[PDB]
Design a protein around this ligand. Structure first.
Ligand SMILES: [Ca+2]
Ligand SMILES: [Ca+2]
Ligand SMILES: [Ca+2]
Ligand SMILES: [Ca+2]
Ligand SMILES: [Cl-]
Ligand SMILES: [Zn+2]
Ligand SMILES: [Zn+2]
Length: 206
């Protein structure tokens, strides 16, 4: 397996990575909240299902509002990258990258694939990086805990922004009510962190 970054390349930053959207209505509201709060983030969106109705514009909206769009690689492949033919695996990924580049009007630079202890499948790592796409990890996921906002606050308040940074993994579908997000932003800002997109979080990686 291949190591992936699980913190930013410099201190003082919180990079939220919203993963497995877009979700009709839910994602639109998250984007509204981020815009109002003046924060930048990252959305690792899927493209394994055709975007229905007003979902399609979300891929472009995220980029236009200063966020990064990353590819959440086809979740139906999660069980095992080694289990499909190398060709099947790679062809699918390549098509998804072309699709999300199209929908977002950009060239993606990042992806979200399954992680184990800060590492991803090497075959998948190689497929992405030969295309100039870096799979990313995360420092903390609030859903790993009984009290998500409390554990977040405990971690942030115990840290020091002059030395620390965080990539925080969230899911659109789990934030249908945006109060937790609002609260997490306040907590981070009160402690002195800047909320950044993945481009800024991972500047100069390697
Ligand atoms: Ca704005
Ligand atoms: Ca605006
Ligand atoms: Ca091939
Ligand atoms: Ca520093
Ligand atoms: Cl604005
Ligand atoms: Zn594992
Ligand atoms: Zn999850």
């Amino acid at each position: 397996e291949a190591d992936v970054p699980d913190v930013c390349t410099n201190s003082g930053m919180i990079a939220i990575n919203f993963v497995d959207g877009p979700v009709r209505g839910v994602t639109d509201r998250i984007l509204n909240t981020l815009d109002e709060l003046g924060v930048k983030a990252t959305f690792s969106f899927t493209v394994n299902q055709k975007a229905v109705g007003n979902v399609g514009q979300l891929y472009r909206r995220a980029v236009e509002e200063g966020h990064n769009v990353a590819l959440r690689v086809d979740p139906s492949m999660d069980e095992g990258y080694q289990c499909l033919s190398q060709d099947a695996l790679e062809n699918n990924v390549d098509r998804e990258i072309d699709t999300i580049d199209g929908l977002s009007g950009t060239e993606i630079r990042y992806a979200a694939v399954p992680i184990c202890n800060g590492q991803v499948n090497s075959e998948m790592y190689n497929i992405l990086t030969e295309r100039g796409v870096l799979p990313v990890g995360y420092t903390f996921c609030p859903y790993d805990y009984d009290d998500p906002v409390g554990e977040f606050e405990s971690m942030i308040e115990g840290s020091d922004p002059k030395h620390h940074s965080f990539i925080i993994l969230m899911h659109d579908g789990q934030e249908a009510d945006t109060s937790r997000l609002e609260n997490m932003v306040k907590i981070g800002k009160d402690k002195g962190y800047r909320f950044v997109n993945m481009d800024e979080c991972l500047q100069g990686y390697k």
